[PDB]
Design a protein around this ligand. Structure first.
Ligand code: ZN
Ligand code: ZN
Lengths: 152, 152
């Protein structure tokens, strides 16, 4: 199945979110996995506060840490993210042709990109991961100014 | 008028593209300008080869160089880019709520994002700048492997 590696992918993505949370950042993590053998091409988390970055969302940092890959490689991967992607991270998935996006939870945040991915021919799976929902609920509760001055 | 600062914005964007050419990168540049007084919030160019970056497109590098701005600031800006935006840079404009995007040319490259911006309620102006067309035509001719292994 396409979902053979989904527990591994979301577990790494959550580890990145928890790591970024301990660093004082937004707890959003991700990873990119080769669908063929489950190998991890890259992993990362939101770097808004760690690097003062306006663009290093969790999904962007994940793709940046993968490095410049061959176009054919992206076409058989799954992008795992703990939080439903914004319009920019949605566009990155579309631009690289990543066919599958697995999302931890879309309760705390959702954009039009989740539906746009399906319109553009991508598969979107929302797993409703309770670990992801809890860590982001805590961030929104404890740091509402940081959240709502950002994607909130 | 709304186009009061458009010659200034594209001139800065082209200078960034030309600077990226001298550094050995893809000649795609941009800048973000406050529509109220024409002040430059940030400028940048494609850093794929300068930093080995998969995500630092010209528009992304421009927004990164602006720093973390207040949400209200983005709402009255124009993003200038020498080349029509890919789906990722299109999504970045949408996510930040930048209402206006002025494009140097869409001859050398164009994605579905140009129309998607208008679908999402953004203004897109294509100026057909001959300087931008020439420098990107030269890059595609001289470095077809680099171009077609990327968004080409
Ligand atoms: Zn995002
Ligand atoms: Zn782009």
């Amino acid at each position: 199945m396409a979902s053979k590696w989904d527990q591994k992918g979301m577990d790494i993505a959550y580890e990145e979110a928890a790591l970024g949370y301990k660093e004082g950042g937004v707890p959003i993590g991700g990873c990119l996995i080769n669908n063929k053998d489950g190998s991890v091409l890259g992993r990362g988390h939101n770097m808004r506060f760690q690097k003062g970055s306006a663009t290093l969302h969790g999904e962007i940092s994940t793709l940046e840490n993968c490095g410049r890959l061959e176009g054919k490689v992206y076409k058989d991967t799954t992008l795992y993210t703990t939080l439903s992607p914004c319009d920019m991270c949605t566009g990155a998935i579309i631009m690289y042709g990543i066919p599958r996006c697995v999302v931890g939870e879309n309760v705390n945040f959702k954009s039009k990109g989740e539906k746009y991915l399906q319109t553009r021919g991508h598969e979107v799976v929302v797993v409703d991961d309770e670990r992801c929902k809890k860590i982001m609920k805590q961030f929104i509760d404890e740091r509402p100014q940081d959240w709502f001055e950002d994607i909130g």
